[PDB]
């Protein structure tokens, strides 16, 4: 028989507008020689979007949320290891159709690749070990309109990064030469609501009490435009501001209850 004792724990950072909703299921099975805990981390990492000021003549800047990193970790001294995690990395696939045709002459060839484009992609962190799992949602293919795909590092020789630039040769204050908030990807100007899962496990022959450190962080980027006199140009400076909220939650394997211990709000403006 399997017995699932469920409990929940929550932490909040009003300063950085980051909330952590953690759901826990303490599955106990005789077939396993260890205890198992499925942690489902949900909640809200606000984008931190700073609207461009409309009274800016030649130079203006916006701070947009570009990467949100959620990491669930365990202490090195404990026996609590991380067996499984989701969403895992994906071997993306695409469908290709090649056509060869001749008119007895107009020999013609054609190749169509059908794929799926997303504005943000979740990948695992290269620091995922036996005691830590991490995921990073980074901006991928952001389309201005029919103009794009662009990203945090695209570059045109003359006009530079044109990610959020309304018109290359328009005539308005720089504050109003950006695309409106409505055309920007949802996660870039609004809340990111994570739905990540991790399966921790602890040898029953261990300390009844352990601690797990869950971190929710946003990495804001600065996009600035300028009028060189002839054309507008843009630049995306990555990880300008890093707002991180880390929380330690004491897990009692004996009584199957989780209690938040300490909360550490950290800022890395650069």
């Amino acid at each position: 028989k399997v017995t699932l004792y469920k409990t929940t724990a929550t932490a909040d950072s009003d300063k950085f507008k980051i909330s952590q909703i953690l759901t826990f299921n303490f599955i106990k099975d005789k077939s396993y020689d260890k205890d198992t805990l499925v942690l489902k981390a949900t909640g809200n990492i606000n984008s931190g979007f700073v609207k461009p000021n409309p009274n800016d003549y030649d130079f203006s800047k916006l701070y947009w949320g570009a990467k949100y990193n959620v990491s669930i970790s365990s202490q090195s001294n404990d026996s609590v290891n991380v067996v499984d995690y989701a969403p895992k990395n994906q071997n993306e696939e695409f469908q290709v159709q090649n056509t060869l045709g001749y008119t007895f002459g107009n020999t013609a060839f054609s190749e169509t690749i059908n794929y799926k484009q997303e504005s943000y992609r979740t990948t695992l962190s290269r620091n995922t070990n036996y005691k830590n799992v991490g995921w990073g949602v980074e901006a991928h293919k952001i389309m201005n309109n029919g103009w794009g795909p662009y990203g945090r590092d695209s570059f045109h020789p003359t006009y530079g990064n044109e990610l959020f630039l309304a018109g290359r040769q328009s005539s308005a204050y720089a504050g109003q030469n950006f695309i409106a908030q409505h055309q920007m990807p949802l996660l870039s100007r609004s809340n990111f609501n994570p739905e990540f899962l991790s399966v921790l496990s602890h040898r029953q022959d261990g300390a009844k009490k352990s601690k797990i450190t869950v971190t929710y962080q946003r990495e804001m980027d600065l996009y600035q435009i300028r009028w060189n006199g002839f054309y507008w140009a843009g630049a995306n400076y990555k990880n300008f501001k890093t707002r991180t909220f880390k929380s330690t939650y004491e897990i009692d394997w004996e009584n199957h209850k989780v209690k938040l211990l300490d909360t550490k709000e950290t800022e890395n403006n650069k």
Partner: protein
């Protein structure tokens, strides 16, 4: 994957309906107390349903009656908030989600070098976005997105939206007919959101939540000048027109009451 979700047991359901005739907003909230034996603390699934009438009104301006105006709803705002420390939000729905589009890239050489790219998406008349979620409360706002009109889809941020060549001297005639108005603008919006609020047992017996339903209305002013229809849109003309009902929940006797409602 392998996650039971704080639900799956006996539910004692209690329903409360209130209506503000002044703002035409109705709150049909159902509070279902869940008693999962496996869950450590107490839990209440609060289902927010009801009717927020669009209150779309087409009328001429007072001083200058030759100028007509349409007050149409832009964003319907729905929110649940708690000031009690014991109660904490553990699950909420619709949640903000990433979006994807099917893309097709074709390169051909008629030995010319034709290239073609088709991006396909599924648009909706009004999009629901989680404006702000904290442990105590959550807020969602159904902002307008795109509308199908003869001759192509039109963004909801276009100034010449919902305006037409005047067919007569009546105000209704300066604006498109009802056959070209989405149902949410013509009639109203029916919310369907679910919020599970857990409460630590032992430290509390009574808890009060304020549920707010509302409407932010934009206005399009149109008038014929020098033989050219001039359309202008005042974004957020009247904002924060909301109704707030504070409901007192006694976790012990499984009874929900209504403390007070503003606008009274």
């Amino acid at each position: 994957k392998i996650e039971d979700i704080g639900q799956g047991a006996e539910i004692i359901k209690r329903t409360q309906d209130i209506t503000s005739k002044r703002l035409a907003i109705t709150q049909n909230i159902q509070f279902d107390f869940v008693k999962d034996k496996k869950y450590n603390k107490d839990a209440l699934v609060v289902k927010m349903q009801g009717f927020i009438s669009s209150r779309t009104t087409y009328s001429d301006l007072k001083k200058y009656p030759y100028i007509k105006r349409m007050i149409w709803p832009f964003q319907y705002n729905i929110s649940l908030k708690t000031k009690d420390s014991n109660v904490d939000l553990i699950n909420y729905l619709p949640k903000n989600k990433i979006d994807s589009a099917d893309v097709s890239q074709k390169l051909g050489y008629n030995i010319s070098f034709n290239y073609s790219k088709t991006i396909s998406y599924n648009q909706k008349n009004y999009v629901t976005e989680v404006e702000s979620q904290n442990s105590k409360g959550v807020k969602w706002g159904v902002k307008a997105n795109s509308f199908v009109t003869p001759n192509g889809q039109v963004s909801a941020y276009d100034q010449y939206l919902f305006a037409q060549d005047p067919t007569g001297p009546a105000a209704r005639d300066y604006f498109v007919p009802d056959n070209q108005l989405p149902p949410l603008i013509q009639s109203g919006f029916n919310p369907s959101f679910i919020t599970t609020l857990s409460h630590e047992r032992g430290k509390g017996d009574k808890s009060e939540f304020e549920i707010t339903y509302g409407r932010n209305m934009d206005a399009t002013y149109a008038y014929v000048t020098r033989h050219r229809l001039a359309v202008d849109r005042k974004h957020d003309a009247f904002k924060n027109r909301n109704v707030t009902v504070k409901y007192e929940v006694n976790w012990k006797t499984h009874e929900v009451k209504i403390k007070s409602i503003t606008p009274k």
